[PDB]
Amino acid sequence: SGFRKMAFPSGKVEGCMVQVTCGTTTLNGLWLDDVVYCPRHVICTSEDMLNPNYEDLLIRKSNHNFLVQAGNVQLRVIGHSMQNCVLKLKVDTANPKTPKYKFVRIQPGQTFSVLACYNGSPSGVYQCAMRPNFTIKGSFLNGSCGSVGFNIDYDCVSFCYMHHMELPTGVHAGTDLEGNFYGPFVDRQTAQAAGTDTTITVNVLAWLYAAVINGDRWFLNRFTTTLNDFNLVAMKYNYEPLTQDHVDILGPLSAQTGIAVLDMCASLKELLQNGMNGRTILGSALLEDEFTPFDVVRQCSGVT
Amino acid sequence: SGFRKMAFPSGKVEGCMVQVTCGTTTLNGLWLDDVVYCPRHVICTSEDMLNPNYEDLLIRKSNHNFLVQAGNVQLRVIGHSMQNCVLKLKVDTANPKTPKYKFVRIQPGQTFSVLACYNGSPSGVYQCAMRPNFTIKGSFLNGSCGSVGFNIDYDCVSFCYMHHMELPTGVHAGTDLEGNFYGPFVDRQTAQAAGTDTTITVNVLAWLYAAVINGDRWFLNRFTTTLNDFNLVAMKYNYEPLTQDHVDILGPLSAQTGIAVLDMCASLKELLQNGMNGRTILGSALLEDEFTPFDVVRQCSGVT
Ligand SMILES: CC(=O)N1CCN(CC(=O)Nc2cncc3ccccc23)CC1
Numbered sequence: 001s002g003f004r005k006m007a008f009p010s011g012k013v014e015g016c017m018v019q020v021t022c023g024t025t026t027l028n029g030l031w032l033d034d035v036v037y038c039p040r041h042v043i044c045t046s047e048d049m050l051n052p053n054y055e056d057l058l059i060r061k062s063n064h065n066f067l068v069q070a071g072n073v074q075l076r077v078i079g080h081s082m083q084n085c086v087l088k089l090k091v092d093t094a095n096p097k098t099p100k101y102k103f104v105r106i107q108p109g110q111t112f113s114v115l116a117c118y119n120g121s122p123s124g125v126y127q128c129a130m131r132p133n134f135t136i137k138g139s140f141l142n143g144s145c146g147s148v149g150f151n152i153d154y155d156c157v158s159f160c161y162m163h164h165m166e167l168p169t170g171v172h173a174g175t176d177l178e179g180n181f182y183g184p185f186v187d188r189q190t191a192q193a194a195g196t197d198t199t200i201t202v203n204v205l206a207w208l209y210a211a212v213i214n215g216d217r218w219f220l221n222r223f224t225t226t227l228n229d230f231n232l233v234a235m236k237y238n239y240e241p242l243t244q245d246h247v248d249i250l251g252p253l254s255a256q257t258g259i260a261v262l263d264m265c266a267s268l269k270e271l272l273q274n275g276m277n278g279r280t281i282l283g284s285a286l287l288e289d290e291f292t293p294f295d296v297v298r299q300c301s302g303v304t
Numbered sequence: 305s306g307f308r309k310m311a312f313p314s315g316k317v318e319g320c321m322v323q324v325t326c327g328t329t330t331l332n333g334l335w336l337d338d339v340v341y342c343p344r345h346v347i348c349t350s351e352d353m354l355n356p357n358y359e360d361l362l363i364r365k366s367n368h369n370f371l372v373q374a375g376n377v378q379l380r381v382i383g384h385s386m387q388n389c390v391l392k393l394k395v396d397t398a399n400p401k402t403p404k405y406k407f408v409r410i411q412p413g414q415t416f417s418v419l420a421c422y423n424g425s426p427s428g429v430y431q432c433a434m435r436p437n438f439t440i441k442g443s444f445l446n447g448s449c450g451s452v453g454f455n456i457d458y459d460c461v462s463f464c465y466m467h468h469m470e471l472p473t474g475v476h477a478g479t480d481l482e483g484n485f486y487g488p489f490v491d492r493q494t495a496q497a498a499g500t501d502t503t504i505t506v507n508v509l510a511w512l513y514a515a516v517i518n519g520d521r522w523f524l525n526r527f528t529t530t531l532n533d534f535n536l537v538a539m540k541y542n543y544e545p546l547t548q549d550h551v552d553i554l555g556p557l558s559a560q561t562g563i564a565v566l567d568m569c570a571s572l573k574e575l576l577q578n579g580m581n582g583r584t585i586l587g588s589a590l591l592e593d594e595f596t597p598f599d600v601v602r603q604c605s606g607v608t
């Protein structure tokens with residue numbers, strides 16, 4: 001029993017983190033096989049960030065200008081290329097610690113672990129989610145760029161995020177490992193405002209199921225609702241619309257607890273309208289939305 | 305910017321986790337040098353747990369009854385001994401992945417990372433704290449015993465906790481790596497109720513300083529207080545008394561923000577008396593107490 005915001009074990013990813021320096025800037029790179037992936041803004045000066053022409057700036061860079069260090073040993077760069085907003089630095093040595101891996105592009109609502117790094121060295125690990133506005137709420141200081149987000153499926157690491165930017169509002173933006181930004185964000189120091197950060201309804205429901213499984217049941221009520229009625233309330237509270245696909249995804253949790261998905265929706269509807277009244281659910285005074293249904297089943301079943 | 309409940313990178317500890325089986329029970333062990341540490345209740349049947357005589361039960365066990373597996377390879381047990389509530393299984397092979405380590409006994413209020421494991425395999429990592437009632441609020445299923453709590457200081461892992469028990473109220477109890485339980489708990493299936501789970505005041509203050517550093521400033525007010533006046537309010541709200549030692553520990557955060565510790569105490573006093581009014585601080589609707597002052601400085605400075 002108990003339910004925590006749990007990250008995946010970070011060891012497999014720690015074995016891939018390297019330091020990348022271009023000129024005076026140092027950030028992190030991800031070393032998989034004989035390729036080091038990093039944000040292309042490593043080539044920029046602070047002046048360049050205002051309106052960078054990355055193809056033009058990259059012409060002035062050679063393999064020997066990209067300093068890649070793995071621990072205290074230098075890697076030899078034998079090629080470089082730009083793929084969207086990431087650089088791929090080909091090195092002469094395959095990472096001996098390369099885990100089984102995949103590059104995946106996640107959807108909003110999906111969670112992942114982040115291994116925050118500075119100078120190619122891991123500082124900490126935390127869990128977050130791709131927000132519906134395509135930002136993430138991370139913990140990143142200067143030097144953290146190139147830190148990655150991932151999920152693990154037994155022994156395969158699915159990398160889904162690489163950190164690139166902090167917006168003026170303190171929220172974060174980045175790319176998948178193909179270098180495509182999530183959402184409309186760009187790697188430029190310009191006015192980029194995020195859209196509405198709606199709540200991930202299917203994840204809140206999953207977390208209410210985790211609460212019931214772990215003994216917190218005070219919020220269960222005598223009501224039910226329909227998807228359409230629930231969605232009228234969800235729209236009012238800036239919650240994402242619940243679809244029949246979400247109801248199907250919640251099936252295993254509904255079966256485990258014996259609480260029909262629409263009955264849990266009615267409990268969530270009352271919590272939205274009535275508030276918590278100073279009470280807590282799984283140690284939280286707000287409705288938590290950064291656990292997917294898969295995360296809840298995984299944590300409640302002890303998948304390793 | 306941003307502030308997350310961050311755990312230490314778990315790789316160094318993943319390299320130490322093994323499976324320990326005695327009879328029909330399988331739990332986790334911690335392999336450091338040529339010793340595997342695990343809960344002594346691995347020798348118990350479910351009937352034994354009601355009133356176990358561990359010295360007597362251990363007489364019936366030989367080295368060959370303790371099956372220790374590291375990954376898919378078996379370790380040879382050449383000795384066994386009981387130290388308080390842990391067993392130390394001497395193996396014929398030193399763990400080649402043994403990090404620099406220490407065994408420390410933490411005080412209530414101190415935080416640590418837990419690497420939840422099942423069958424010697426890591427499932428996830430999360431952050432928690434030694435509660436003032438000597439319980440921890442973890443996420444542990446059957447099979448998780450022997451999972452450990454730790455802190456890292458650059459390359460030295462300080463192990464502080466080994467998981468042993470879940471109380472009937474869903475909270476957790478365990479030992480340090482010398483086998484001494486935190487608090488009054490015992491490794492017996494008996495009536496063990498926890499005391500008051502008071503809030504760790506110095507940690508709440510540290511987290512309010514993290515909120516100011518990360519831009520959440522709405523709770524700052526025009527007031528100040530004294531330690532004695534603040535403590536009258538803290539006692540009323542089941543908060544731990546704040547001492548001058550806590551004020552001294554908060555010095556670096558006070559210097560960073562320019563907010564005197566007693567002024568922050570006055571902000572905390574108003575939040576306790578007035579509530580949050582539906583507002584949030586660092587994405588929380590309650591006052592968070594599982595970040596120590598050291599955690600706040602570490603996260604806000606990017607220590608690796
Ligand atoms: C060349 C240059 O000045 N830069 C700085 C800006 N960066 C982009 C950028 O947004 N970086 C950062 C990302 N995350 C957290 C951050 C905290 C603090 C400061 C910068 C952060 C490009 C490279």
Ligand SMILES: CC(=O)N1CCN(CC(=O)Nc2cncc3ccccc23)CC1
Pocket residue numbers: 001329345348349350353444445446447448449468469470471
């Ligand atoms: C021999 C035996 O039956 N046991 C079981 C009890 N254990 C003690 C015990 O409290 N274990 C557990 C610890 N943490 C989470 C847990 C969730 C679910 C169940 C058991 C948990 C001794 C060994």
